[PDB]
Amino acid sequence: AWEIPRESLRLEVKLGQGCFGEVWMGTWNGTTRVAIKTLKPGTMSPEAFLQEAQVMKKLRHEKLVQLYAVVSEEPIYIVTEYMSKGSLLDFLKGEMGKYLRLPQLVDMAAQIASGMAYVERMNYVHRDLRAANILVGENLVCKVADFGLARLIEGAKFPIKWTAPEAALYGRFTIKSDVWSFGILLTELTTKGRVPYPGMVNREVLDQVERGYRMPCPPECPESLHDLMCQCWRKDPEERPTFEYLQAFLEDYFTSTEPQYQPGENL
Numbered sequence: 001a002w003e004i005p006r007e008s009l010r011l012e013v014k015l016g017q018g019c020f021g022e023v024w025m026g027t028w029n030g031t032t033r034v035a036i037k038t039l040k041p042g043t044m045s046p047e048a049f050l051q052e053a054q055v056m057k058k059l060r061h062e063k064l065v066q067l068y069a070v071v072s073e074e075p076i077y078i079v080t081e082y083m084s085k086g087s088l089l090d091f092l093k094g095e096m097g098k099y100l101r102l103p104q105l106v107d108m109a110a111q112i113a114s115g116m117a118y119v120e121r122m123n124y125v126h127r128d129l130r131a132a133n134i135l136v137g138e139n140l141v142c143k144v145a146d147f148g149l150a151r152l153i154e155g156a157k158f159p160i161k162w163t164a165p166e167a168a169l170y171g172r173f174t175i176k177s178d179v180w181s182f183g184i185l186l187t188e189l190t191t192k193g194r195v196p197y198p199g200m201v202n203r204e205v206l207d208q209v210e211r212g213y214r215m216p217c218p219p220e221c222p223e224s225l226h227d228l229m230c231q232c233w234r235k236d237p238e239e240r241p242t243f244e245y246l247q248a249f250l251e252d253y254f255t256s257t258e259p260q261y262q263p264g265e266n267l
């Protein structure tokens, strides 16, 4: 019943293209502006492509990108709501980046924690939480997207710089490894989109994180916010905070934690 006829869709503008398929902005039933994830016909199994839609069928939250429809016969289409400002990573790196200060950045973080706390409640794992997988809409609304690797808890290698070591090394993906990634996401926000562990290659990152290395407090980031990051990067997955706590901490941040915050030059 999520099924629609393919002639119901008009693809128009390209927005991006991954190496397992493409993403277009389109029109649904001639009335609704949508986004249409397409498949590169041969890159990966059609059933592997559709599992992303399988997952999105079960999830529904204001801070997760919403599934609209599916075409499950080749060529395959996953149809979702359209996000007008593109990826958070591009937004932070773009011309808006320099004007964002801590209050807009923390509010973006709160929204992401809200969507993820919902994922937490439903017993899903995302497994690719990072700023390139968050989408920005009107009024600085942020929604988590790309549930390509997401699954209910019962590829070959993951971006180690965002992945909790137990998950990178032994495949132990839990909501607490998503919490690890959220901490790394917090450093992307507070540095306006810089790659984590500047100057370190993947192996060096792995070796040092095992030996206890953690990224320092970014310039102008408050120590209370870097404390939060460090709790997210606790070696013991179960010492890591929940998203429910993270959501509430970030929504209340400027009253309960940093009530005397003054804007600086970049944050």
Ligand SMILES: N#CC[C@H](C1CCCC1)n1cc(-c2ncnc3[nH]ccc23)cn1
Pocket (backbone or CB within 6 Å): 015, 016, 017, 018, 019, 023, 035, 037, 065, 080, 081, 082, 083, 084, 085, 086, 087, 132, 133, 134, 135, 145, 146
């Ligand atoms: N690679 C490429 C995939 C791309 C990544 C960006 C966030 C999720 C993955 N992606 C963007 C979308 C999308 N969905 C809805 N509105 C949008 N606007 C711009 C991109 C976009 C879906 N996937």
